[PDB]
Amino acid sequence: HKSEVAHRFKDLGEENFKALVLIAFAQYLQQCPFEDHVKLVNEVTEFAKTCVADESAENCDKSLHTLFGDKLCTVATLRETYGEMADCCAKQEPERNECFLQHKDDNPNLPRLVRPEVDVMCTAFHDNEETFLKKYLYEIARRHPYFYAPELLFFAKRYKAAFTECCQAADKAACLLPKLDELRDEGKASSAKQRLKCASLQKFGERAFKAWAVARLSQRFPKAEFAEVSKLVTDLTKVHTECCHGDLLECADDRADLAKYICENQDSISSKLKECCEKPLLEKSHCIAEVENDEMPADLPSLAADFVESKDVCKNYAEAKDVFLGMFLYEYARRHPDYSVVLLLRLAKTYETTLEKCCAAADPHECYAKVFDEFKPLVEEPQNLIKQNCELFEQLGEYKFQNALLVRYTKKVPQVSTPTLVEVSRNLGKVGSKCCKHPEAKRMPCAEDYLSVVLNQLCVLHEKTPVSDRVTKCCTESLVNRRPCFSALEVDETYVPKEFNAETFTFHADICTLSEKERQIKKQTALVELVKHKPKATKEQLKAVMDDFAAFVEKCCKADDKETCFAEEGKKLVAASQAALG
Ligand SMILES: CCCCCCCCCCCCCC(=O)O
Numbered sequence: 001h002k003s004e005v006a007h008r009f010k011d012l013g014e015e016n017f018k019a020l021v022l023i024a025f026a027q028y029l030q031q032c033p034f035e036d037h038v039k040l041v042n043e044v045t046e047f048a049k050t051c052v053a054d055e056s057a058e059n060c061d062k063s064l065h066t067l068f069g070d071k072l073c074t075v076a077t078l079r080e081t082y083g084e085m086a087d088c089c090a091k092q093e094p095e096r097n098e099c100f101l102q103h104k105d106d107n108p109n110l111p112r113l114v115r116p117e118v119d120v121m122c123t124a125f126h127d128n129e130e131t132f133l134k135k136y137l138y139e140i141a142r143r144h145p146y147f148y149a150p151e152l153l154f155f156a157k158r159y160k161a162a163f164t165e166c167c168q169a170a171d172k173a174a175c176l177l178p179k180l181d182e183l184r185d186e187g188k189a190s191s192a193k194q195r196l197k198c199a200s201l202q203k204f205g206e207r208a209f210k211a212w213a214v215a216r217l218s219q220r221f222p223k224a225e226f227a228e229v230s231k232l233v234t235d236l237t238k239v240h241t242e243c244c245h246g247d248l249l250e251c252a253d254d255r256a257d258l259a260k261y262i263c264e265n266q267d268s269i270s271s272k273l274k275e276c277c278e279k280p281l282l283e284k285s286h287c288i289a290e291v292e293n294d295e296m297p298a299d300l301p302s303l304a305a306d307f308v309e310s311k312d313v314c315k316n317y318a319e320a321k322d323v324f325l326g327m328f329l330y331e332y333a334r335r336h337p338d339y340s341v342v343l344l345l346r347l348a349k350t351y352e353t354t355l356e357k358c359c360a361a362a363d364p365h366e367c368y369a370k371v372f373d374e375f376k377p378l379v380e381e382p383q384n385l386i387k388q389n390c391e392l393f394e395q396l397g398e399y400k401f402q403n404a405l406l407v408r409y410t411k412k413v414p415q416v417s418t419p420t421l422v423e424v425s426r427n428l429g430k431v432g433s434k435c436c437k438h439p440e441a442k443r444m445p446c447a448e449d450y451l452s453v454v455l456n457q458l459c460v461l462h463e464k465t466p467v468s469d470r471v472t473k474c475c476t477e478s479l480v481n482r483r484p485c486f487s488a489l490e491v492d493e494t495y496v497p498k499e500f501n502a503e504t505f506t507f508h509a510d511i512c513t514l515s516e517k518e519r520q521i522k523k524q525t526a527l528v529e530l531v532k533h534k535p536k537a538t539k540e541q542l543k544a545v546m547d548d549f550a551a552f553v554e555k556c557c558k559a560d561d562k563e564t565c566f567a568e569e570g571k572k573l574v575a576a577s578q579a580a581l582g
Pocket residue numbers: 008020021024044064067068149150249251252253255256259281282284285286
């Protein structure tokens with residue numbers, strides 16, 4: 001239309017438009033205070049209303065990109081505050097937009113957002129919901145300048161719903177703090193998952209990216225024909241490519257274009273899209289990305305005929321290797337929503353390797369007649385890890401499961417930092433409690449999804465402060481080999497026990513006072529150090545010290561003198577332990 005502002009304003013609606021403009025400037029003027037942004041928003045919003053009344057009104061025909069940069073260049077202190085960013089303004093439009101993109105600061109130096117008291121939060125929420133939510137919306141977005149704006153908005157609406165429900169409850173903190181934790185974790189995960197898409201594309205290329213998409217969409221839309229899955233994969237890959245480049249309007253337009261093609265082609269795609277396809281422009285593409293897997297056709301044969309038994313396997317393969325392999329991924333994927341995408345990819349690569357070797361062999365048909373047998377152990381490996389970890393988790397609770405893991409991994413990579421070991425072991429543990437809750441059918445997809453985040457966070461930390469080549473090996477390997485790489489780590493026999501540190505195994509009565517969280521953390525911190533000082537300590541020995549420590553803590557927490565107790569019982573416990581371990 002003549003006016004991009006007016007058209008966006010109309011299908012977004014005033015409220016969404018204003019939130020979106022606020023997020024958009026916050027991510028670029030990360031050092032301007034909230035009031036300045038509220039001022040920008042009001043000005044852009046007034047102007048937008050001008051174009052809605054009259055598409056022909058002044059400057060209404062300019063692109064949003066132009067209007068956005070004009071506004072940015074309008075900021076008084078732009079130069080004093082942002083230096084080089086101000087130079088973008090000297091450029092003509094196409095170049096200016098690309099220049100602004102380059103000068104977002106990724107890790108802006110602001111203090112951490114501290115969670116205030118439930119009482120002070122609810123009071124603020126009550127006293128002025130808008131400023132309360134928009135200011136925190138501003139704070140978050142200036143700290144996460146690459147977080148997709150509409151996804152940040154979808155989160156903010158969930159925070160809104162949390163306060164609404166909890167600030168008028170009964171035990172506010174009881175209701176609210178668990179929701180805030182969930183929101184925070186979820187949001188951290190979505191951010192890491194977004195950066196992971198772009199980096200994986202960069203490091204591993206379009207072909208790998210598309211392979212991944214074939215598998216996933218095939219599971220999602222098993223009724224769609226390969227041709228339609230492959231059209232979707234091509235467009236999906238284009239979308240991510242544009243989005244990783246980082247221009248928000250272009251990302252949003254590409255995302256919206258894909259959703260409406262999908263919505264216009266439901267019958268060729270999935271029977272599940274009705275609800276998503278009736279949602280407004282803003283939530284449509286997001287609804288589709290999360291839609292339940294559709295039911296598979298039911299009368300599906302067996303891959304043997306097309307992929308093993310058929311003469312023409314090598315002919316069909318040679319004629320279009322990636323298409324053939326992609327048809328193979330397709331057919332296996334739609335039959336197996338129960339697998340993780342990465343396993344499907346292992347199978348595809350195994351099938352590929354076999355064909356490479358077999359179509360150049362004396363007798364191809366005999367050569368690959370048994371390729372399906374090679375899939376068995378690949379499949380069975382994650383399935384057995386699930387059963388073993390989930391059984392253990394059913395014996396031990398979550399927390400004693402986290403302890404099991406902590407003893408497990410400290411022995412494998414005892415060089416890793418204690419905090420990193422505690423953190424990662426606690427995270428792996430949640431993955432357990434969560435995914436083990438599902439029936440067998442949804443466990444691997446579950447594990448894959450959350451393992452990608454935990455394992456990515458681990459490699460991110462380790463890449464910034466390397467410590468074990470092995471850890472670094474698993475982190476840099478293909479995303480398909482990553483979890484198996486970590487799984488294949490064993491006990492570090494190279495390791496020289498950490499020398500005894502008295503203070504490390506000293507406790508005070510404040511432990512009786514910490515929250516449940518920080519008490520676990522301090523116990524688990526000590527548990528790691530225990531395994532670090534005595535690495536060859538046995539499972540039976542370890543429990544004996546753990547039961548003593550537990551008793552120790554209970555005793556000195558109940559005593560008419562806690563502190564004195566922690567000190568004297570404390571020396572007893574330690575000496576007794578230093579002896580129990582040979
Ligand atoms: C002029 C200020 C720029 C404001 C940018 C807000 C527009 C964002 C629209 C996002 C629409 C979502 C599309 C989608 O993800 O499917």
